[PDB]
Design a protein around this ligand. Structure first.
Ligand SMILES: NC(=O)c1ccc[n+]([C@@H]2O[C@H](COP(=O)([O-])OP(=O)(O)OC[C@H]3O[C@@H](n4cnc5c(N)ncnc54)[C@H](O)[C@@H]3O)[C@@H](O)[C@H]2O)c1
Ligand SMILES: NC(=O)c1ccc[n+]([C@@H]2O[C@H](COP(=O)([O-])OP(=O)(O)OC[C@H]3O[C@@H](n4cnc5c(N)ncnc54)[C@H](O)[C@@H]3O)[C@@H](O)[C@H]2O)c1
Lengths: 331, 331
């Protein structure tokens, strides 16, 4: 027969079918937890495709008896224990840049929304606020600032980070970044300022934007400690990973006024909701349901790509046939 | 004594005082209509400073017996009959570019908000909408599109228009403009595509943004007729003047789905309100209280500039001492 491949936290396989039809048996679990995965999958599944709504711990992975590959349909793979999966002889792959630009564009939208207060002005206009005179325009739009000369501090100058830096220049932002893993000289190639430490970046930035993956070393990068290093009344943007920020610290900082405002597309606990979590009633906070990456073309693109990776894996050799394996070291 | 100068539709003169103290007698009317202006002003006022919340018709101007100059504290001067004022020997001046960039930045914010649906996703998140699965992200974020390759059609390649074009390139927008008053060749200097007619621009643009002043020839530039020339499901942005768009036509087009969405910072009838006007319940519509221009620095900048113009006028000669007179022809 043809190897079984399962879509863990999803139920739509229309885009992948044309590509896997003759080489695999497609199936979906639409699971909201690993406990929701059926026995037949854990026993026979050779490949697996998953999104970000489900986590896979070592315990989870050990329950698969034939799993040979897990392809993340997206960028981040922090929801998967690449290490354990590797030891278990399970190759983990992702989809690197199908939405790099969708993400940079949303990032810029958040940045501008904080500086120009577009969303808040609209939200207030819906609240019935009246704005007839200039004095009232100034009051309702209070805080809107002139962007030219502001310092945008980027944390993580990777694919998205670079796309953000380039867009940022056009608005007159002075751009500087921090990324301890990059080789020296990239800052010269793109004409950007680089700093050696996080505190350095935080201290000189008027607006801080996260663009690094969530790893074993940056959990809660933004702490009650580091938040204290940020400028007074600085903006914070995060379209990377919720786990990079300690919402409790952020909430406090937002109430005290230390941070003028934050735009978050990702949160420590997703699904996100204003009714619960440390961000409840937190002042000047704009949120989005983790859609920074979305655009129909990108969704379609990343799915056909994930599908092809599965195909290469089933028809070729692991990890030789794979194009985006992220745990070769543990294999 | 020192000539009387009055602030028509406003009541704050703190920023102008330091500059006019020894050469003029400051006063304010905080008028919401010309009928609200007091007799002493119409009789003795030599200079006048005004915003955009009040209109001045020929009838209005003729009621001044000593008015020698009117300085608009801002960019647009369509609310003033420059022609009549000129015939009445009244010089009209404005403040050209104190907020050029604030405006371009808001314009970009609106453009991105339509493409990335940041504001709507946030507004829905407040409505209690739940977004836990990928399928739901795709549904709630439906319509968010990949910007690269989209055609941004700019109408009016002046100060703001140019700032918008430059920012737009960085997002991968193919930029093209229409501006029948510019000399030939500006498109070569900035590396942009230019078209000869409005229909031309409208037909090839995925997103249309207005950046022209409101004049005797473009009232309701966007009509039931011209709207029909726009692409199917095109976006419309307007941070220029409300009078450039026939809200009735826009409303219809928005309901029928011909126009996927619109972002308006200006409206035919300001103060704007969702409770009244042709835009009531109009689908996919984002609005702002005419704050595209605001930033404390710009507000301060334009006021000290207007103040200096008044000073030059009172201490020098009209229209020789003026730096930004917009009705020299009628003088
Ligand atoms: N909100 C969304 O829908 C969305 C969209 C795209 C990507 N993701 C987020 O963005 C990340 C991927 O970005 P790319 O930009 O696609 O990734 P890359 O292309 O993986 O870039 C990430 C960069 O982060 C740097 N980095 C790691 N740890 C760091 C630290 N402690 N300090 C500073 N820099 C650090 C790396 O060295 C690397 O250059 C994902 O891991 C995820 O968190 C989310
Ligand atoms: N929303 C706000 O707060 C805000 C902020 C700044 C300016 N204003 C708006 O923007 C205008 C000023 O822009 P600039 O960009 O400052 O002005 P300019 O610098 O006066 O530019 C306007 C351009 O419009 C062009 N134009 C006139 N009629 C046209 C037509 N029918 N078709 C195409 N182009 C046409 C002109 O030739 C000119 O190049 C004002 O008149 C006003 O309507 C509003």
């Amino acid at each position: 027969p043809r190897p079984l491949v399962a879509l863990l936290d999803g139920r739509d396989c229309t885009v992948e079918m044309p590509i896997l039809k003759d080489v695999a048996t497609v199936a979906f679990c639409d699971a909201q937890s690993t406990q929701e995965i059926h026995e037949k999958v854990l026993n026979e599944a050779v490949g697996a495709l998953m999104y970000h709504t489900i986590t896979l711990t070592r315990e989870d992975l050990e329950k698969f008896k034939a799993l040979r590959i897990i392809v993340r349909i997206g960028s981040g793979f922090d929801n998967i224990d690449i290490k354990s999966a590797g030891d278990l002889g399970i190759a983990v792959c992702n989809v690197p840049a199908a939405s790099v630009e969708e993400t940079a564009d949303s990032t810029l939208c958040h940045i501008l929304n904080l500086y120009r207060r577009t969303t808040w002005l609209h939200q207030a206009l819906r609240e019935g606020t009246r704005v007839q005179s200039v004095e009232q325009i100034r009051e309702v739009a209070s805080g809107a600032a002139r962007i030219r000369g502001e310092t945008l501090g980027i944390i993580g100058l990777g694919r998205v980070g670079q796309a953000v830096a380039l867009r940022a220049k056009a608005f007159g932002f002075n751009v500087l970044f921090y990324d301890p893993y990059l080789s020296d000289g990239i800052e010269r190639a793109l004409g950007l300022q680089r700093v050696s430490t996080l505190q350095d970046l935080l201290f000189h930035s008027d607006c801080v934007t996260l663009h690094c993956g969530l790893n074993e070393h940056n959990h809660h990068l933004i702490n009650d400690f580091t938040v204290k290093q940020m400028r007074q009344g600085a903006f914070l943007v995060n379209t990377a990973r919720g786990g990079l920020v300690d919402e409790k610290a952020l909430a406090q900082a937002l109430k005290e006024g230390r941070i003028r405002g934050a735009a978050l597309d990702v949160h420590e606990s997703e699904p996100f909701s204003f009714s619960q979590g440390p961000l409840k009633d937190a002042p000047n906070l704009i949120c989005t349901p983790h859609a920074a990456w979305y655009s129909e073309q990108a969704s379609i693109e990343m799915r056909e790509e994930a599908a092809r990776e599965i195909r290469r894996a089933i028809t070729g050799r692991i990890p030789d046939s794979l194009k985006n394996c992220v745990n070769k070291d543990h294999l």
